[PDB]
Amino acid sequence: IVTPVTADVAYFQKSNSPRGRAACVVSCENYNQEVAEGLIYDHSRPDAAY
Amino acid sequence: PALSASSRALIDEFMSVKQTHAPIHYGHYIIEEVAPVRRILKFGNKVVF
Amino acid sequence: EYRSTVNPWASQLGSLGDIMYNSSYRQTAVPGLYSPCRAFFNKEELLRNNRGLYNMVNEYSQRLGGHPATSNTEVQFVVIAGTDVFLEQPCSFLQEAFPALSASSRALIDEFMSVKQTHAPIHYGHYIIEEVAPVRRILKFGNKVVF
Amino acid sequence: KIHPGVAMTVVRTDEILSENILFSSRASTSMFIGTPNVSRREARVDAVTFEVHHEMASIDTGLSYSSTMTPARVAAITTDMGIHTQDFFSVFPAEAFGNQQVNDYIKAKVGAQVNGAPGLCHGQQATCEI
Amino acid sequence: PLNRRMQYSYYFPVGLFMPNPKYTTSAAIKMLDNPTQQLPVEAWIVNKN
Amino acid sequence: PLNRRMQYSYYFPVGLFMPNPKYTTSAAIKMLDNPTQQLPVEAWIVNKN
Amino acid sequence: LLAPGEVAVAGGGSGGGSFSWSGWRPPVFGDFLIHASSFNNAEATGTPLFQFKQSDPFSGVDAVFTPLSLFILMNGGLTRMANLLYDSPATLADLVPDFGRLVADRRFHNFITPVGPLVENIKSTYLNKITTVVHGPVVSKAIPRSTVKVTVPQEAFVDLDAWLS
Amino acid sequence: DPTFTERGFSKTVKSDLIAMFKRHLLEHSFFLDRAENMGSGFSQYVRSR
Amino acid sequence: MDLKVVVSLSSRLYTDEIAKMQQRIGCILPLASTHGTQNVQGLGLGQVYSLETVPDYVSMYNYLSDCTLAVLDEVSVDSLILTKIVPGQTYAIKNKYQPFFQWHGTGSLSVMPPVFGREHATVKLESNDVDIVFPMVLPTPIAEEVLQKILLFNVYSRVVMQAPGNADMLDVHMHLGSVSYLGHHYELALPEVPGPLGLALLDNLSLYFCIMVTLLPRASMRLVRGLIRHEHHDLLNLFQEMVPDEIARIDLDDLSVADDLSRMRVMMTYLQSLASLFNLGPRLATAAYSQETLTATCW
In DSSP notation, A37-49 reads HHHHH--SS--S-
Work out whether strand I136-139 and strand G64-65 pair parallel, antiparallel, or are unpaired.
unpaired
Round to whole Å and give the CA distance between I250 and I245. Answer: 9
Which residue in chain C has the smallest CA separation from B32?
A: C142
CA of D62 vs chain G CAs: smallest distance (Å): 23
Round to whole Å and give the CA distance between D44 and I291. Answer: 20
CA of E9 vs chain F CAs: smallest distance (Å): 33
CB contact under 8 A, F23 and C111: no
Task: Identify all chain C residues contacting A10, using CB atoms and an 8 Å cutoff.
Answer: 106
List of E strands, D25-102: 29-33, 37-41, 49-53, 56-60, 67-77
Task: Identify all chain F residues contacting E33, using CB atoms and an 8 Å cutoff.
Answer: 21
CA geometry: angle B38, B41, B44, nearest 5 deg: 165
Q: If 0-12 CB within 10 Å is exposed, 13-18 middle and 19+ buried, where does residue C87 land?
A: buried
- For F46, residues 6+ apart whose C-beta sits below 8 A from its C-beta are B3, B41
Taking Cα atoms as reference points, which of D19, A29, G59 lies closest to residue H6? D19
CA geometry: angle C29, C33, C35, nearest 5 deg: 90
Dihedral of alpha carbons I192, I195, I201, I207, sign: positive
- For H32, residues 6+ apart whose C-beta sits below 8 A from its C-beta are H46
CA geometry: angle G132, G135, G141, nearest 5 deg: 40
Q: If 0-12 CB within 10 Å is exposed, 13-18 middle and 19+ buried, where does residue D118 land?
A: buried
For residue C75, the tally of other CB atoms under 10 A from its CB is: 19
Do H10 and C69 contact (CB within 8 A), yes or no? no
CB-side neighbour CA atoms (13 Å) of B1: 21
Do I91 and D44 contact (CB within 8 A), yes or no? yes
* Dihedral angle of Cα I257, I259, I265, I270, to the nearest 10 degrees: -150
Say whether I42 sits in a helix, a strand or coil: coil
Do G34 and G130 contact (CB within 8 A), yes or no? yes
Subunit partners of chain D (3 or more CB pairs within 8 A): A, C, E, G, H, I
Taking Cα atoms as reference points, which of F13, F33, F11 lies closest to residue F22? F33
CA of E36 vs chain H CAs: smallest distance (Å): 44
CB contact under 8 A, F36 and E31: no
Amino acid found at C31: P
Q: B-side interface with C, Cβ within 8 Å?
A: 18-24, 32-34
Do I219 and I183 contact (CB within 8 A), yes or no? no
In DSSP notation, G17-82 reads --S-STT--PPEEEEEEEETTTS-TTS-SS-EEEE----STT--SB-EE-HHHHHHHT---HHHHH
For residue I87, the tally of other CB atoms under 10 A from its CB is: 7
Amino acid found at G140: S
Furthest C-alpha separation in chain G: 61
Distance of CA B21 to CAs B38, C29, C127, G126, I23, Å? 19, 52, 21, 53, 68
CB contact under 8 A, B1 and A9: no
Provide the 8-state DSSP code for D76: E
Q: Tell whether G143 is within 8 A of chain D (Cβ).
A: yes
Work out whether strand E3-14 and strand C98-99 pair parallel, antiparallel, or are unpaired.
parallel
Round to whole Å and give the CA distance between G129 and G120. Answer: 8
Show which of residues 12-41 on chain B sit within 8 Å of chain A, judged by CB atoms.
Answer: 23-24, 29, 31-32, 34
Round to whole Å and give the CA distance between E27 and E18. Answer: 20
Ramachandran sector of residue F18 (left: φ over 0; alpha: ψ -120 to 50; beta: rest): beta
Do G75 and G49 contact (CB within 8 A), yes or no? no
Round to whole Å and give the CA distance between C90 and C68. Answer: 12
Q: If 0-12 CB within 10 Å is exposed, 13-18 middle and 19+ buried, where does residue I144 land?
A: middle
Taking Cα atoms as reference points, which of G108, G130, G109 lies closest to residue G121? G130
Q: How many cross-chain Cβ pairs, E to H, lie less than 8 Å apart?
A: 3
CA I12 to chain centre: 34
Round to whole Å and give the CA distance between C58 and C60. Answer: 5
Taking Cα atoms as reference points, which of H11, I253, H25, E17 lies closest to residue D124? H11
Q: What residues pair up with I179 in beta bridges, in sequence order?
A: I186
* Dihedral angle of Cα C53, C54, C60, C61, to the nearest 10 degrees: 160
Q: If 0-12 CB within 10 Å is exposed, 13-18 middle and 19+ buried, where does residue D111 land?
A: exposed
For residue D91, the tally of other CB atoms under 10 A from its CB is: 19
CA G101 to chain centre: 25
CB contact under 8 A, E46 and C101: yes
Taking Cα atoms as reference points, which of C87, C96, C84 lies closest to residue C66? C87
Number of H helices, E strands in chain F: 0, 2
CA of C133 vs chain G CAs: smallest distance (Å): 26
CB contact under 8 A, D39 and G1: yes
Round to whole Å and give the CA distance between I85 and G121. Answer: 35
Round to whole Å and give the CA distance between G113 and I287. Answer: 13
Optimal mutation site among D35, D38, D40, D95, interface G, most CBs of chain G within 10 A: D40
Q: How many cross-chain Cβ pairs, D to G, lie less than 8 Å apart?
A: 36
* Dihedral angle of Cα C3, C5, C6, C11, to the nearest 10 degrees: 180
Do G133 and G27 contact (CB within 8 A), yes or no? yes
Round to whole Å and give the CA distance between I106 and I287. Answer: 5
CA of D53 vs chain G CAs: smallest distance (Å): 9
Task: Identify all chain F residues contacting B31, using CB atoms and an 8 Å cutoff.
Answer: 12
* Residues across chain G: 165
Do I19 and I76 contact (CB within 8 A), yes or no? no
* Dihedral angle of Cα D97, D99, D100, D105, to the nearest 10 degrees: -80
Do I298 and I93 contact (CB within 8 A), yes or no? yes
- Phi, psi torsion values for I38, nearest 5 degrees: -140, 150
Q: What residues pair up with C88 in beta bridges, in sequence order?
A: E6
Q: If 0-12 CB within 10 Å is exposed, 13-18 middle and 19+ buried, where does residue G135 land?
A: middle
CA D117 to chain centre: 19
Amino acid found at I113: P
CA of D4 vs chain G CAs: smallest distance (Å): 31
Q: A-side interface with C, Cβ within 8 Å?
A: 10, 13
Q: How many cross-chain Cβ pairs, A to H, lie less than 8 Å apart?
A: 12
Round to whole Å and give the CA distance between I64 and I56. Answer: 13
Round to whole Å and give the CA distance between G2 and G13. Answer: 8
For residue I221, the tally of other CB atoms under 10 A from its CB is: 17
Distance of CA H45 to CAs B49, H29, H40, I257, Å? 21, 14, 9, 107
Round to whole Å and give the CA distance between A20 and C43. Answer: 46
CA of D16 vs chain I CAs: smallest distance (Å): 30
Task: Identify all chain F residues contacting C111, using CB atoms and an 8 Å cutoff.
Answer: 25
Number of H helices, E strands in chain H: 3, 0
Round to whole Å and give the CA distance between I126 and I22. Answer: 16
Q: D-side interface with A, Cβ within 8 Å?
A: 115-122
Taking Cα atoms as reference points, which of I58, I69, I269, I68 lies closest to residue I147? I58
Give the closest of I3, I83, I90 to D42, CB-based.
Answer: I90
Q: Tell whether C144 is within 8 A of chain A (Cβ).
A: no
Do chains F and B have 3 or more beta-carbon pairs under 8 angstroms?
yes
Round to whole Å and give the CA distance between I286 and I7. Answer: 28
Show which of residues 119-148 on chain G sit within 8 Å of chain I, judged by CB atoms.
Answer: 134-135
Task: Identify all chain H residues contacting C74, using CB atoms and an 8 Å cutoff.
Answer: 11-12
Round to whole Å and give the CA distance between G74 and G67. Answer: 11
What method was applied to determine this entry? Answer: cryo-EM
Do C88 and E8 contact (CB within 8 A), yes or no? no
CB contact under 8 A, E49 and H3: no
Round to whole Å and give the CA distance between D12 and E9. Answer: 6
Task: Identify all chain C residues contacting H13, using CB atoms and an 8 Å cutoff.
Answer: 72
For chain C, the residues before each gap (C–N > 2.5 Å) are: none
CA of D31 vs chain A CAs: smallest distance (Å): 47
CA of G25 vs chain I CAs: smallest distance (Å): 7
Round to whole Å and give the CA distance between F39 and B25. Answer: 12
Do I296 and I93 contact (CB within 8 A), yes or no? yes
- For G62, residues 6+ apart whose C-beta sits below 8 A from its C-beta are C80, C81, G32, G33, G34, G51, G54
Task: Identify all chain D residues contacting I185, using CB atoms and an 8 Å cutoff.
Answer: none
Distance of CA I84 to CAs A33, I32, I62, Å? 42, 11, 20
- For F6, residues 6+ apart whose C-beta sits below 8 A from its C-beta are B36
Round to whole Å and give the CA distance between I113 and I61. Answer: 7
Which residue in chain B has the smallest CA separation from A14?
A: B1
Round to whole Å and give the CA distance between G120 and G103. Answer: 32
Do C123 and C108 contact (CB within 8 A), yes or no? yes
Round to whole Å and give the CA distance between E42 and E38. Answer: 12
Q: What residues pair up with C129 in beta bridges, in sequence order?
A: C102
Say whether I74 sits in a helix, a strand or coil: strand
Amino acid found at C43: K
Say whether I181 sits in a helix, a strand or coil: strand
CA geometry: angle E17, C3, C13, nearest 5 deg: 90
Subunit partners of chain I (3 or more CB pairs within 8 A): D, G
Q: C-side interface with B, Cβ within 8 Å?
A: 106, 110, 114-115, 142-144
Burial A1-24 (b: 16+ CB within 10 A, else e): eeeeeeeebeebbeebeeebbbbb
